[PDB]
């Protein structure tokens, strides 16, 4: 009975468009809203077999594909399509999640869902609903697979102070079901870089950075002794912090029309690679990271340099990633370029901190391809120029301290560098 | 007059500074194990050895900084003093911790200092609040690196202004580490006192 009801009631959404907004469009919108409300009501407080679930999912997919397949109009901005889609996307996603967690779903239906969602990636409301559902799934995954509550955490307290979908017969939230569900829902939009509208790309990547931040918070909160009397061994299961890097590396080579997306991707990758790494990354990943960082640092837009320097403390140098010598020269050049500019919004403090952090590398890293004497001369010239030109007191103080550290290093190693006297003169005049 | 003369003689005649030095081994993230260490790595011992000579507390006539003659608080401690500045380190790897009362005494001695040199070889970043203490406005943290290099990170209270010749995130070699760390700690103590 309910199967034939939904099959017969699917026609209300397939109703013809109306040219009269005040009455015909309003009535059609109200009827479709009532139908989707009763669909949402029945999707939660009722039980059904797999055939009913498949029929409901097919009906929802067909309705979404039919009512939202009119992109040929630009001057016409009827509220009908967006008004329906705003609720339709949420209903479709919730129904899909419930069906997947309740009964088995064939892979053909999954492929059809992926295709119909990828072909309709030009709507911002879809992006917002995907972000919200991903947040909810991530909260569920954190609560289930890792035994960590998102509402209250040991770090938060310190601040205050087999599954059926997996081929079994168990229904509910389980580590097997939640993991695969979260992994599959992540790629519903498909390859993000295929998105055309730059605003949509920026929104998706901002939400991706927020997602990575939540994952990092969960990872940091793990393995904490509540009693402060015995340090537990690290768990065998850790959140996958560096999983989105494949999207970021491709998003970094997009043309200039996606500048905001490139900035967000740079911020995300820089914040990702600047923390402690539980497992050593593979050689190919390191090659890709070095290539993208080299391309970013030697760019021309000042915003790229500002974003890549403002979020890259020398902790990246401290991590000791293999083969990071070329980054020394690239960072020196980037710091010189950013400090040459006199814009007051530039990250002067971070720039001078990065510049002074490398002050001891050339002496200990003799005969580095990226000459040692030439690199030292360039670095000391930049330091001397900064110590007498920085308009910000914090940057000037850091520059003076770095110059003093350089003098101490030169004296200790007994280089007999003629530039030492000039640095002493600079200190004396100060 | 006798009481006033005794009180005047009690006051020091130089600049006195009190510094706490900790130690962290791999896999330690709790107060009990961090305060129960009785020895450190070779690099840590060399670094502490570069902060001043050793003085026998039994027959030491200089500054004490809360230490006791009976040997309960330890038998040796590093000592560095000049014509006008005198600094004594409360190294946590020299004070015996074989009993709970010893742990309480060590905690109440180290928690009264305003500068902490928190050496850390741990695989995870140091977190504020591991060792409870009312004081501790400056916490210099050292993370060893490859090729004998070292990493220095400084966390300070917002009220404390810029004080040290070692900026946050500075990277120094092994030779410069003791002198720079000692000078930074002295300057931090001066800033905290002037606060």
């Amino acid at each position: 009975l309910l199967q034939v009801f939904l099959t017969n009631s699917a026609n209300i959404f397939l109703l013809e468009p109306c040219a009269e907004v005040p009455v015909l469009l309003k009535e059609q919108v109200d009827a479709c809203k009532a139908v989707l409300i009763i669909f949402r009501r029945m999707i939660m407080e009722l039980t059904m077999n797999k055939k009913t679930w498949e029929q409901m999912l097919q009906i929802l997919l067909r309705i979404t594909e039919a009512v939202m397949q009119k992109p040929k109009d630009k001057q016409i901005k009827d509220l009908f399509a967006q008004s329906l889609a705003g609720l339709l996307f949420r209903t479709l996603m919730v129904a899909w999640i419930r069906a997947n967690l309740c009964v088995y779903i064939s892979r053909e239906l999954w492929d059809d869902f992926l295709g119909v969602l990828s072909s309709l990636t030009e709507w911002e409301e879809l992006i917002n609903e995907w972000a919200n559902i991903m947040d909810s799934l991530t909260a569920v995954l954190a609560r289930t697979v890792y035994g960590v509550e998102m509402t209250n955490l040991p770090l938060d307290k310190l601040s205050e102070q087999c599954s059926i979908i997996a081929g079994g017969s168990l229904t509910g939230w389980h580590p097997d079901s939640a993991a695969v569900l979260w992994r599959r829902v992540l790629g519903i939009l498909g390859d993000v870089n295929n998105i055309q509208s730059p605003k949509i790309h920026a929104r998706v990547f901002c939400y991706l950075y927020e997602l990575w931040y939540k994952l990092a918070k969960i990872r940091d909160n793990l393995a904490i002794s509540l009693d402060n009397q015995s340090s537990p061994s690290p768990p065998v299961l850790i959140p996958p912090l560096r999983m989105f890097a494949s999207w970021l590396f491709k998003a970094a080579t997009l043309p200039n029309e996606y500048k905001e997306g490139k900035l967000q991707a740079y911020r995300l990758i820089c914040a990702m690679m600047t923390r402690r790494q539980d497992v050593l990354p593979n050689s190919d990943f390191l090659v890709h990271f070095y290539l993208v960082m080299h391309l970013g640092l030697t760019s021309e837009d000042q915003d790229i340099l500002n974003t890549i320097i403002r979020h890259c403390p020398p902790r990246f140098f401290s991590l000791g990633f293999p083969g990071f010598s070329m980054l020394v020269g690239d960072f020196i050049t980037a710091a010189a370029r950013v400090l040459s500019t006199d814009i007051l919004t530039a990250p002067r403090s971070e720039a001078v901190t990065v510049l002074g952090s490398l002050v001891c590398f050339p002496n200990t890293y003799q005969e580095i391809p990226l000459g040692t004497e030439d690199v030292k001369h360039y670095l000391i010239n930049i330091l001397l120029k900064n110590a007498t030109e920085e308009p910000n007191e914090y940057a000037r103080c850091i520059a003076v301290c770095s110059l003093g550290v350089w003098i101490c290093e030169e004296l200790a190693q007994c280089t007999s560098h003629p530039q030492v006297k000039e640095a002493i003169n600079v200190i004396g005049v100060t | 007059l006798l009481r006033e003369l005794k009180n005047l003689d009690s006051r020091q005649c130089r600049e006195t500074h009190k510094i706490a030095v900790f130690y962290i081994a791999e896999g330690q993230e709790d107060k009990c194990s961090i305060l129960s260490n009785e020895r450190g790595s070779q690099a840590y011992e060399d670094f502490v050895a570069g902060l001043g000579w050793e003085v026998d507390l039994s027959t030491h006539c200089g500054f004490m900084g809360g230490l006791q003659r009976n040997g309960s608080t330890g038998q040796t401690a590093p000592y560095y003093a000049t014509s006008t500045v005198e600094v004594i380190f409360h190294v946590s790897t020299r004070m015996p911790s074989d009993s709970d009362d010893s742990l309480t005494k060590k905690l109440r001695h180290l928690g009264n200092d305003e500068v902490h040199i928190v050496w850390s070889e741990h695989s995870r970043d140091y977190r504020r609040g591991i060792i409870p203490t009312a004081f501790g406005d400056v916490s210099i943290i050292i993370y060893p690196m490859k090729n004998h290099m070292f990493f220095i990170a400084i966390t300070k209270k917002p009220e404390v202004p810029f004080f040290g010749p070692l900026f946050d995130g500075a990277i120094v070699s092994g030779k410069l580490l003791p002198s720079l760390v000692c000078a930074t700690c002295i300057n931090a103590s001066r800033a905290v006192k002037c606060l």
Binding site: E390, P391, N392, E393, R396 | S83, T84
Partner: peptide
């Protein structure tokens, strides 16, 4: 960049006394 005895006499007296006494 964008930006009660007097201490100096006492400091001068202390420095002179220290230099006279402890130098060498």
């Amino acid at each position: 960049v964008k930006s009660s005895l007097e201490l100096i006499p006492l400091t001068a007296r202390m420095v002179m006394a220290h230099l006279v006494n402890h130098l060498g």
